[PDB]
Design an enzyme around this catalytic site. Sequence first.
Site, PDB file in Angstrom:
ATOM      1  N   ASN B 164       0.809  -1.205   0.000  1.00  0.00           N
ATOM      2  CA  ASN B 164       0.000   0.000   0.000  1.00  0.00           C
ATOM      3  C   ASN B 164       0.843   1.255   0.000  1.00  0.00           C
ATOM      4  O   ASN B 164       1.872   1.320   0.680  1.00  0.00           O
ATOM      5  CB  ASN B 164      -0.918   0.011   1.213  1.00  0.00           C
ATOM      6  CG  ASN B 164      -2.099   0.931   0.996  1.00  0.00           C
ATOM      7  OD1 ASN B 164      -3.076   0.503   0.407  1.00  0.00           O
ATOM      8  ND2 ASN B 164      -2.007   2.143   1.535  1.00  0.00           N
ATOM      9  N   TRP B 165       0.397   2.230  -0.812  1.00  0.00           N
ATOM     10  CA  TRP B 165       0.887   3.597  -0.848  1.00  0.00           C
ATOM     11  C   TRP B 165      -0.203   4.564  -0.401  1.00  0.00           C
ATOM     12  O   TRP B 165      -1.287   4.566  -0.986  1.00  0.00           O
ATOM     13  CB  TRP B 165       1.315   3.921  -2.279  1.00  0.00           C
ATOM     14  CG  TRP B 165       2.508   3.180  -2.834  1.00  0.00           C
ATOM     15  CD1 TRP B 165       3.351   2.327  -2.171  1.00  0.00           C
ATOM     16  CD2 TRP B 165       3.006   3.278  -4.180  1.00  0.00           C
ATOM     17  NE1 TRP B 165       4.382   1.913  -3.009  1.00  0.00           N
ATOM     18  CE2 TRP B 165       4.186   2.500  -4.235  1.00  0.00           C
ATOM     19  CE3 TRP B 165       2.603   3.980  -5.316  1.00  0.00           C
ATOM     20  CZ2 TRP B 165       4.969   2.402  -5.397  1.00  0.00           C
ATOM     21  CZ3 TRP B 165       3.362   3.868  -6.469  1.00  0.00           C
ATOM     22  CH2 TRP B 165       4.542   3.103  -6.501  1.00  0.00           C
ATOM     23  N   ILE B 167      -0.982   8.630   1.796  1.00  0.00           N
ATOM     24  CA  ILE B 167      -0.616   9.811   2.555  1.00  0.00           C
ATOM     25  C   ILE B 167      -1.296   9.712   3.909  1.00  0.00           C
ATOM     26  O   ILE B 167      -2.512   9.574   4.016  1.00  0.00           O
ATOM     27  CB  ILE B 167      -1.035  11.112   1.862  1.00  0.00           C
ATOM     28  CG1 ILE B 167      -0.453  11.150   0.444  1.00  0.00           C
ATOM     29  CG2 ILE B 167      -0.580  12.301   2.700  1.00  0.00           C
ATOM     30  CD1 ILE B 167      -0.823  12.399  -0.331  1.00  0.00           C
ATOM     31  N   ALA B 168      -0.491   9.883   4.956  1.00  0.00           N
ATOM     32  CA  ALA B 168      -0.937  10.114   6.334  1.00  0.00           C
ATOM     33  C   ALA B 168       0.097  10.992   6.990  1.00  0.00           C
ATOM     34  O   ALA B 168       1.304  10.842   6.708  1.00  0.00           O
ATOM     35  CB  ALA B 168      -1.070   8.824   7.113  1.00  0.00           C
ATOM     36  N   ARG B 169      -0.334  11.932   7.831  1.00  0.00           N
ATOM     37  CA  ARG B 169       0.593  12.929   8.385  1.00  0.00           C
ATOM     38  C   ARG B 169       1.569  12.305   9.381  1.00  0.00           C
ATOM     39  O   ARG B 169       1.282  11.303  10.028  1.00  0.00           O
ATOM     40  CB  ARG B 169      -0.169  14.016   9.141  1.00  0.00           C
ATOM     41  CG  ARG B 169      -0.812  13.584  10.440  1.00  0.00           C
ATOM     42  CD  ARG B 169      -1.639  14.700  10.994  1.00  0.00           C
ATOM     43  NE  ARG B 169      -1.996  14.500  12.386  1.00  0.00           N
ATOM     44  CZ  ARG B 169      -3.087  14.912  12.989  1.00  0.00           C
ATOM     45  NH1 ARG B 169      -4.045  15.578  12.358  1.00  0.00           N
ATOM     46  NH2 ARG B 169      -3.200  14.699  14.285  1.00  0.00           N
ATOM     47  N   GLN B 186      -8.110   3.173   7.530  1.00  0.00           N
ATOM     48  CA  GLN B 186      -7.116   3.431   6.502  1.00  0.00           C
ATOM     49  C   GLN B 186      -6.230   2.221   6.275  1.00  0.00           C
ATOM     50  O   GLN B 186      -5.999   1.408   7.171  1.00  0.00           O
ATOM     51  CB  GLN B 186      -6.296   4.654   6.895  1.00  0.00           C
ATOM     52  CG  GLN B 186      -7.163   5.902   7.098  1.00  0.00           C
ATOM     53  CD  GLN B 186      -7.793   6.426   5.839  1.00  0.00           C
ATOM     54  OE1 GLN B 186      -8.646   5.792   5.226  1.00  0.00           O
ATOM     55  NE2 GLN B 186      -7.372   7.626   5.454  1.00  0.00           N
ATOM     56  N   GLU B 229      -1.272  -0.014  -4.970  1.00  0.00           N
ATOM     57  CA  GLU B 229      -1.341   1.261  -5.712  1.00  0.00           C
ATOM     58  C   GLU B 229      -0.364   1.260  -6.883  1.00  0.00           C
ATOM     59  O   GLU B 229      -0.691   1.825  -7.915  1.00  0.00           O
ATOM     60  CB  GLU B 229      -1.058   2.491  -4.860  1.00  0.00           C
ATOM     61  CG  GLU B 229      -2.219   2.949  -4.002  1.00  0.00           C
ATOM     62  CD  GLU B 229      -2.566   2.106  -2.813  1.00  0.00           C
ATOM     63  OE1 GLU B 229      -1.818   1.180  -2.423  1.00  0.00           O
ATOM     64  OE2 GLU B 229      -3.605   2.457  -2.159  1.00  0.00           O
ATOM     65  N   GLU B 278      -5.625  21.263  10.480  1.00  0.00           N
ATOM     66  CA  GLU B 278      -6.159  20.154   9.688  1.00  0.00           C
ATOM     67  C   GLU B 278      -7.089  20.670   8.583  1.00  0.00           C
ATOM     68  O   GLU B 278      -7.420  21.862   8.479  1.00  0.00           O
ATOM     69  CB  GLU B 278      -6.924  19.164  10.582  1.00  0.00           C
ATOM     70  CG  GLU B 278      -6.131  18.439  11.675  1.00  0.00           C
ATOM     71  CD  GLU B 278      -6.989  17.602  12.633  1.00  0.00           C
ATOM     72  OE1 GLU B 278      -8.291  17.740  12.635  1.00  0.00           O
ATOM     73  OE2 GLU B 278      -6.366  16.776  13.422  1.00  0.00           O
ATOM     74  N   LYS B 387     -15.402   2.075   3.276  1.00  0.00           N
ATOM     75  CA  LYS B 387     -14.257   2.937   3.536  1.00  0.00           C
ATOM     76  C   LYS B 387     -14.239   4.185   2.649  1.00  0.00           C
ATOM     77  O   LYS B 387     -13.830   5.240   3.088  1.00  0.00           O
ATOM     78  CB  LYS B 387     -12.957   2.139   3.378  1.00  0.00           C
ATOM     79  CG  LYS B 387     -11.712   2.987   3.466  1.00  0.00           C
ATOM     80  CD  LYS B 387     -10.484   2.148   3.543  1.00  0.00           C
ATOM     81  CE  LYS B 387      -9.177   2.865   3.349  1.00  0.00           C
ATOM     82  NZ  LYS B 387      -9.145   3.523   2.033  1.00  0.00           N
TER      83      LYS B 387
HETATM   84  C1  LIG Z   1      -3.808  14.546   0.224  1.00  0.00           C
HETATM   85  C2  LIG Z   1      -3.720  14.280   1.705  1.00  0.00           C
HETATM   86  C3  LIG Z   1      -4.355  13.162   2.204  1.00  0.00           C
HETATM   87  C4  LIG Z   1      -4.376  12.918   3.606  1.00  0.00           C
HETATM   88  C5  LIG Z   1      -3.686  13.737   4.449  1.00  0.00           C
HETATM   89  C6  LIG Z   1      -3.040  14.911   3.956  1.00  0.00           C
HETATM   90  C7  LIG Z   1      -3.025  15.149   2.563  1.00  0.00           C
HETATM   91  C8  LIG Z   1      -2.313  16.343   1.954  1.00  0.00           C
HETATM   92  C9  LIG Z   1      -2.284  15.689   5.041  1.00  0.00           C
HETATM   93  C10 LIG Z   1      -1.869  17.116   4.707  1.00  0.00           C
HETATM   94  C11 LIG Z   1      -1.021  14.919   5.471  1.00  0.00           C
HETATM   95  C12 LIG Z   1      -3.265  15.850   6.213  1.00  0.00           C
HETATM   96  C13 LIG Z   1      -3.547  14.514   6.845  1.00  0.00           C
HETATM   97  O1  LIG Z   1      -4.609  14.585   7.780  1.00  0.00           O
HETATM   98  N1  LIG Z   1      -3.731  13.483   5.815  1.00  0.00           N
HETATM   99  C14 LIG Z   1      -4.111  12.227   6.284  1.00  0.00           C
HETATM  100  C15 LIG Z   1      -4.866  11.396   5.430  1.00  0.00           C
HETATM  101  N2  LIG Z   1      -5.321  10.200   5.791  1.00  0.00           N
HETATM  102  C16 LIG Z   1      -5.040   9.794   6.994  1.00  0.00           C
HETATM  103  O2  LIG Z   1      -5.333   8.603   7.387  1.00  0.00           O
HETATM  104  N3  LIG Z   1      -4.248  10.487   7.836  1.00  0.00           N
HETATM  105  C17 LIG Z   1      -3.786  11.767   7.531  1.00  0.00           C
HETATM  106  O3  LIG Z   1      -3.050  12.359   8.337  1.00  0.00           O
HETATM  107  N4  LIG Z   1      -5.107  11.803   4.126  1.00  0.00           N
HETATM  108  C18 LIG Z   1      -6.083  11.074   3.307  1.00  0.00           C
HETATM  109  C19 LIG Z   1      -5.599   9.728   2.766  1.00  0.00           C
HETATM  110  O4  LIG Z   1      -4.435   9.861   1.950  1.00  0.00           O
HETATM  111  C20 LIG Z   1      -6.670   9.033   1.920  1.00  0.00           C
HETATM  112  O5  LIG Z   1      -7.781   8.766   2.797  1.00  0.00           O
HETATM  113  C21 LIG Z   1      -6.190   7.754   1.211  1.00  0.00           C
HETATM  114  O6  LIG Z   1      -7.361   7.146   0.684  1.00  0.00           O
HETATM  115  C22 LIG Z   1      -5.482   6.802   2.140  1.00  0.00           C
HETATM  116  O7  LIG Z   1      -4.921   5.735   1.297  1.00  0.00           O
HETATM  117  P1  LIG Z   1      -5.473   4.230   1.512  1.00  0.00           P
HETATM  118  O8  LIG Z   1      -5.501   3.976   3.013  1.00  0.00           O
HETATM  119  O9  LIG Z   1      -6.857   4.231   0.856  1.00  0.00           O
HETATM  120  O10 LIG Z   1      -4.459   3.446   0.708  1.00  0.00           O
HETATM  121  K   LIG Z   2      -4.271   5.077  -1.547  1.00  0.00           K
HETATM  122 MN   LIG Z   3      -4.724   1.613  -0.489  1.00  0.00          MN
END
Ligand SMILES: Cc1cc2c3c(c1C)C(C)(C)C[C@@H](O)N3c1c(nc(O)[nH]c1=O)N2C[C@H](O)[C@H](O)[C@H](O)COP(=O)(O)O
Ligand SMILES: [K+]
Ligand SMILES: [Mn+2]
Lengths: 500, 500
Positions: B164-165, B167-169, B186, B229, B278, B387
């Site tokens: 998995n790829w 974004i999470a802070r 997530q 991904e 946030e 989800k």
């Molecule tokens: C574009 C983007 C997406 C996310 C985040 C940010 C950006 C810029 C931060 C600025 C870092 C703010 C942060 O709150 N952040 C974030 C986050 N999801 C989380 O679990 N935790 C997070 O901290 N997502 C959303 C996730 O990226 C999506 O929900 C994605 O669907 C997850 O991928 P997957 O688990 O489906 O593979």
């Molecule tokens: K993803």
């Molecule tokens: Mn995924």
Amino acid sequence: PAHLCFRSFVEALKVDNDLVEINTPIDPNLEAAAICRRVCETNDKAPLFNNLIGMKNGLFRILGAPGSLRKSSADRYGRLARHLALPPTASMREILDKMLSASDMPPIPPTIVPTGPCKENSLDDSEFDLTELPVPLIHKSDGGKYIQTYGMHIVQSPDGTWTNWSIARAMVHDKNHLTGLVIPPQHIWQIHQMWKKEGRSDVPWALAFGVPPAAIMASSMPIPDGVTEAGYVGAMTGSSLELVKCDTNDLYVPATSEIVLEGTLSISETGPEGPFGEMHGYIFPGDTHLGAKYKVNRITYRNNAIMPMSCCGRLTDETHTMIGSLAAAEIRKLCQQNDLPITDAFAPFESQVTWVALRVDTEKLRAMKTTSEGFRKRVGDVVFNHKAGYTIHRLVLVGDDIDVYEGKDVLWAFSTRCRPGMDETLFEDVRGFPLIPYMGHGNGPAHRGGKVVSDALMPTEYTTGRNWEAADFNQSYPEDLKQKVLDNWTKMGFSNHHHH
Amino acid sequence: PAHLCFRSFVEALKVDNDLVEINTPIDPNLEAAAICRRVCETNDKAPLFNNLIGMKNGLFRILGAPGSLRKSSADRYGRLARHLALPPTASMREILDKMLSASDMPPIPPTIVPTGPCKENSLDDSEFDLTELPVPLIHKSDGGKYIQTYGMHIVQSPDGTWTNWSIARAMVHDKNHLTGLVIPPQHIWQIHQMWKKEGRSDVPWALAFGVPPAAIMASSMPIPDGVTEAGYVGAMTGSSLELVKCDTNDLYVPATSEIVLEGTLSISETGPEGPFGEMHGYIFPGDTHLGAKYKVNRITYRNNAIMPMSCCGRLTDETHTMIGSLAAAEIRKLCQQNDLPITDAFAPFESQVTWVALRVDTEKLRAMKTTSEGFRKRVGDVVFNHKAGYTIHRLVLVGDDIDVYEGKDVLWAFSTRCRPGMDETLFEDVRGFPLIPYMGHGNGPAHRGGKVVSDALMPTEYTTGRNWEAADFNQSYPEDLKQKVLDNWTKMGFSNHHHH
Ligand SMILES: Cc1cc2c3c(c1C)C(C)(C)C[C@@H](O)N3c1c(nc(O)[nH]c1=O)N2C[C@H](O)[C@H](O)[C@H](O)COP(=O)(O)O
Ligand SMILES: [K+]
Ligand SMILES: [Mn+2]
Ligand SMILES: Cc1cc2c3c(c1C)C(C)(C)C[C@@H](O)N3c1c(nc(O)[nH]c1=O)N2C[C@H](O)[C@H](O)[C@H](O)COP(=O)(O)O
Ligand SMILES: [K+]
Ligand SMILES: [K+]
Ligand SMILES: [K+]
Ligand SMILES: [Mn+2]
């Protein structure tokens, strides 16, 4: 002055470079209103149609978009300000405060004068035919030609003690009758009811078009039951309004009215009325219902008379800038008089003026030692059981950080601080506004319910105080840094005027 | 190409006249983020900070606002288009269709290459200190320096079958650890859970910053459980992504990654995390909680490495343009796969991307011979139990006349076609998104409920068809008249360019 004489108001819009005079022939069948509609959807200059196909014996020119928005933010509300002697850069708070100012002043009753410009010309019952005038077809599916979109109906209680001025729509029925909306809880309806219960005669009536701008503003505001708008406008303007008697009845019209119809509102007869392209942005073709019927006995008018027209519909026109904002103003006052800590109210345009956002003094709220469920109920009972709340289906409570005159900030607060369901109280046993499609054309009772108080106060706003800072440029960076960034902005290569 | 290499993407923004290079010293303590915040609030050019106070051994430059909006309507979404090889004038429908296109294609697995630019430099565990790098303080009350706002976490299931790829802070904890959010549902959390149940070791991990733009877009999209991904991005782009092995583990990172951290996500340890300004526009000072803890063992990086940063908060940034829109895309598909007649979905910015508007094919709806209450329940059960619906608290159903990509039209439909209460179904027994203030800082359970389906379909849209016309210029005037008005507009004296 422009606020006291409609002709002078038209001249003020010219001087402001806020008028387009169209001197070539324009068809009142849809063309005038189509131009007006585009103006309103694009915040362009008000159109003055000086050459209206079918204009007969001086009747009539049309001014559209009289209370609509200007394009620049600096004088956005300039046309409203021009109704009230305010600077064209007046804020909405300033406009609404002006409209509320007379509510704790003694009325200044009107002054009767023996004549005025509205008596320059007359047509008796053998000389006019309302079907022969250049009355506009405003929307292609309207059920009639809506002569009456921005004039003032004048009716008086049987006992003479209350004379009401209000806007309600009316269309031509035949050569000497109109049909229109006369619906509860509106004051034209309340007075009609008084005459119907007395059962003796039709209601003496006049409809005055191109009245003093300050008078048409009050005409559009739900000031209290039993209050004579003329005296409230007098107090607001600091000047007694000059009125002349009608020729065929003992009502009194503004001396400088452009066009006056005199006659009767029937206590027994009805006629087909509507449909009409309405303030929420819709028309339901073929949706005709019986409305109130008016008989016209006499027309008087100014030389080169000008008919104002509201070409209402989707954003932004008089139905939004005046109905919504002036209801919000009255609601603000009503809440304060009921000891609720409301500082400001506005009906967001984005809500199609069906919401009112109430800004709360949260220091006062904290002292009340209350809860969301209790406060929401109190606020909705005050507003939704009162006539001032008639048109409004959602109240949004917001704390002191929100500028309720900024729809983006109201939408942000609503979307992020009010939990759907839990943070809301629904009101089903209140009068509803049937014009809203989801009411009159919806799944439930057209006249009842469908109202909600949405609490966008956060929990600590009831207890110990706001416990967040916005994640924005204003609040998430110290002052010295913000100013450094702004001072170096163009230098670094980014882009930037108030007027624009 | 720009969609496959972040350095090339930066060059594309320059060529587009969509970059401001700041070559004078800028402080990563708030100043870089303040500039970024103003950019995002004003839709200005992306800032590239080439001279960051504290930049050590090539680490690092910062690019802000990588996925934010441009000022002109014609190329509003140009930065997103530049992530995907699309024309800069691409519509949101075109962008989301591109992001969904791989969902009915075979994956194209990645290609392993022996090296790449991300191996130009390295620092072992005796050579770096994360507290010594120019990691930004993004908001004045943040609880740490948020190194990770726009990089891609890379974790793999214990069995090797799913990589998995996402974004999470994450923020710096100490010289060789981060803390961050790892929360259900997530995929980083789902995979973490798998490793914790196996109970043998910490999770092998990498975090890659400045990855191929098409990869960071998928990183931000809730593609299905168990889908790698890399293979979805491969299918979307028509090209196998080139990946290199990490030095200290057997995960694979994009060859052209700007900066790579290698290490472990603990299955046992936590550390203080947050608060953070946030996506919904707030920070709650002092609101620190235990988060997931990462150990960093190795850093590799490109010469003159560039760290992308999302300075998230109030409108408009990556948290709105990417989180909201890409969730909406997946929701659209999910509804269609469940045989619901949804043609389009978007999360209005005005809702702070907490709503998704679903455009309904009402011809299909009519054939279903259903009701609002039944359809609302069906739609909310599909979306809110999945989800893809996690972040979304209000679904707005609208008919075919509404362009869901236009917030003004969604707000008009919601405000005028959905009767509060009666036309809605509340969902309390679904997972809630705690980041929304009214959830995590609200009156009810932070993790459950607070969801609603709001039906802005009118009654006849279920039966016989739309029974209104809009009271607008487009729908209330015939074609020939409209065109006459437009053709004579400037001639009459009114005011008018697409690009601008
Ligand atoms: C574009 C983007 C997406 C996310 C985040 C940010 C950006 C810029 C931060 C600025 C870092 C703010 C942060 O709150 N952040 C974030 C986050 N999801 C989380 O679990 N935790 C997070 O901290 N997502 C959303 C996730 O990226 C999506 O929900 C994605 O669907 C997850 O991928 P997957 O688990 O489906 O593979
Ligand atoms: K993803
Ligand atoms: Mn995924
Ligand atoms: C500014 C403005 C106000 C109104 C209207 C219009 C304009 C431009 C029309 C374009 C004609 C559209 C029409 O639907 N219309 C209208 C109406 N009230 C009605 O009972 N009936 C109506 O047909 N109001 C609102 C009323 O003017 C206010 O509610 C006022 O408060 C009433 O005065 P009162 O009963 O409080 O004295
Ligand atoms: K009135
Ligand atoms: K609340
Ligand atoms: K509905
Ligand atoms: Mn009144």
